[PDB]
Amino acid sequence: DMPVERILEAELAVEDPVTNICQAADKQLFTLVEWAKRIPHFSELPLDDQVILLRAGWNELLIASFSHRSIAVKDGILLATGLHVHRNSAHSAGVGAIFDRVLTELVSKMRDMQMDKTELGCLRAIVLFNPDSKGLSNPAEVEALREKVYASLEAYCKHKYPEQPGRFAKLLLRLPALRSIGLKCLEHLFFFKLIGDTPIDTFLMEMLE
Amino acid sequence: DMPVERILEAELAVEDPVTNICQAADKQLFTLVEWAKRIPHFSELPLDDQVILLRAGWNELLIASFSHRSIAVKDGILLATGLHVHRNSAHSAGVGAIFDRVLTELVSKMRDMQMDKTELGCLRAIVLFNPDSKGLSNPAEVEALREKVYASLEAYCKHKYPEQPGRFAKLLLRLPALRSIGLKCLEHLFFFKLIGDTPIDTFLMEMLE
Amino acid sequence: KHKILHRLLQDS
Amino acid sequence: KHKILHRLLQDS
Ligand SMILES: O=C(O)CCc1nc(-c2ccccc2)c(-c2cc(C(F)(F)F)cc(C(F)(F)F)c2)o1
Numbered sequence: 087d088m089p090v091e092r093i094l095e096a097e098l099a100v101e102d103p104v105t106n107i108c109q110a111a112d113k114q115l116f117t118l119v120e121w122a123k124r125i126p127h128f129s130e131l132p133l134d135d136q137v138i139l140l141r142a143g144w145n146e147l148l149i150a151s152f153s154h155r156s157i158a159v160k161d162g163i164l165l166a167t168g169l170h171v172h173r174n175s176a177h178s179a180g181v182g183a184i185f186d187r188v189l190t191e192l193v194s195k196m197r198d199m200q201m202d203k204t205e206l207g208c209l210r211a212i213v214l215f216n217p218d219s220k221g222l223s224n225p226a227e228v229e230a231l232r233e234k235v236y237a238s239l240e241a242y243c244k245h246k247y248p249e250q251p252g253r254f255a256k257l258l259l260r261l262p263a264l265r266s267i268g269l270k271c272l273e274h275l276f277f278f279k280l281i282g283d284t285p286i287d288t289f290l291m292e293m294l295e
Numbered sequence: 296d297m298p299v300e301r302i303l304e305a306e307l308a309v310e311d312p313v314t315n316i317c318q319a320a321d322k323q324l325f326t327l328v329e330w331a332k333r334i335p336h337f338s339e340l341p342l343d344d345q346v347i348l349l350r351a352g353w354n355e356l357l358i359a360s361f362s363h364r365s366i367a368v369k370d371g372i373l374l375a376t377g378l379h380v381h382r383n384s385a386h387s388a389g390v391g392a393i394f395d396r397v398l399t400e401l402v403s404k405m406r407d408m409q410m411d412k413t414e415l416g417c418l419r420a421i422v423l424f425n426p427d428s429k430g431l432s433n434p435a436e437v438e439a440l441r442e443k444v445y446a447s448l449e450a451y452c453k454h455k456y457p458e459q460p461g462r463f464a465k466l467l468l469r470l471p472a473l474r475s476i477g478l479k480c481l482e483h484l485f486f487f488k489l490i491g492d493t494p495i496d497t498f499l500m501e502m503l504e
Numbered sequence: 505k506h507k508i509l510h511r512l513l514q515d516s
Numbered sequence: 517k518h519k520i521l522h523r524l525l526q527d528s
């Protein structure tokens with residue numbers, strides 16, 4: 087019902103600094119939809135619930151991806167557009183605090199444990215299948231799907247890294263940081279939109295309205 | 296090093312609606328300190344880090360407690376002061392949205408899985424031992440302590456509920472909701488403080504300054 | 505002293 | 517058009 091192989095194949099299928107960030111977000115919103123469509127059972131949910139799951143999740147899903155992408159980078163994030171944002175660029179643009187939280191709580195934690203792409207895919211699929219999302223026609227179903235992802239993820243972790251009995255728990259326990267950081271990032275984008283200092287492209291605009 | 300028995304003994308040791316809520320929070324801030332002092336190895340950390348851990352965590356720790364306390368309640372929360380806040384009181388006071396998020400994401404999820412007090416204590420201890428907390432002199436140590444709590448918690452879950460292989464994961468996966476809800480609650484209290492519509496007692500005041 | 509109105513407006 | 521100043525003030 088939920089093979090880690092399909093989740094990995096979904097990650098692999100889809101592979102002013104604040105202006106560059108906002109352009110990259112917009113670009114990745116399109117990719118995000120394709121990614122989700124390749125997560126087993128997602129495209130079978132009602133269209134309304136697919137929309138709710140992606141509206142509840144997109145920010146955490148984009149942050150999980152660019153954080154994991156940035157593993158191979160000293161004091162920076164790699165954007166989907168091929169540009170880097172260096173610490174000092176982020177700080178100089180006035181998004182230093184959130185950029186530092188991204189490196190310390192996500193990027194360096196992913197690098198330090200060598201989080202693999204199957205593990206990233208699973209965490210993102212758990213995020214996607216968020217049964218707390220308001221207005222779901224069938225939350226029980228979304229929760230079942232989440233249970234199947236994390237069941238698969240634990241089995242993968244136990245088999246692949248048998249020497250790390252804490253790995254599964256450690257992956258799950260980046261999801262609170264992802265939640266905080268996602269909320270802080272929304273708050274920045276609402277402010278950018280509100281003062282309208284920076285271009286916000288049509289899909290990113292829609293995700294904020 | 297981290298027996299679930301000591302964590303339970305710590306829970307058991309310490310056993311305008313917005314005015315009542317703020318009074319209850321203040322009262323429980325005192326209890327929170329005593330609770331933390333009974334979590335193995337907490338009182339051995341440097342005083343500075345104890346202060347950081349409790350300043351980073353108090354909101355999530357109070358919310359975990361009153362949510363679990365409110366399991367036996369229809370459409371309400373039980374305050375530590377012995378008062379109930381009913382849905383309609385919360386809605387009538389203008390904190391309906393956050394109150395509903397508390398019932399749907401925490402109280403009803405704790406009730407539905409029958410989260411026990413050992414499991415609550417562990418989740419609260421995991422929250423307490425938050426290695427992402429800014430300014431920790433030794434984050435590695437706090438992370439070790441967190442690893443030992445969740446190691447203990449999984450063992451407890453596997454032994455006590457062997458029929459529920461997903462229980463451990465399910466407990467961990469209330470921590471994102473706890474993070475969001477904690478942040479939303481802070482935002483309400485900052486607003487109450489700012490407009491100063493309601494008394495905010497000295498310890499609660501200090502936690503917000 | 506418009507408690508409920510102020511609370512509902514401040515929120516996001 | 518005081519981008520950085522506005523951003524740093526708005527934040528909490
Ligand atoms: O290239 C990509 O895959 C997406 C790029 C991206 N995507 C995002 C993103 C994050 C949340 C929601 C939407 C987009 C952000 C983002 C990153 C930061 C930073 F601090 F890490 F540099 C800050 C911010 C923000 F200003 F919003 F605070 C955004 O960057």
Ligand SMILES: O=C(O)CCc1nc(-c2ccccc2)c(-c2cc(C(F)(F)F)cc(C(F)(F)F)c2)o1
Nearest residue numbers: 316319320323354357361374375393394397480483
């Ligand atoms: O009795 C106790 O153990 C603590 C009581 C308590 N303690 C808290 C609490 C929550 C976060 C930080 C500090 C206190 C809150 C709190 C609860 C709500 C409610 F919606 F669930 F009703 C709302 C709010 C708030 F207005 F802040 F949104 C608070 O209530």
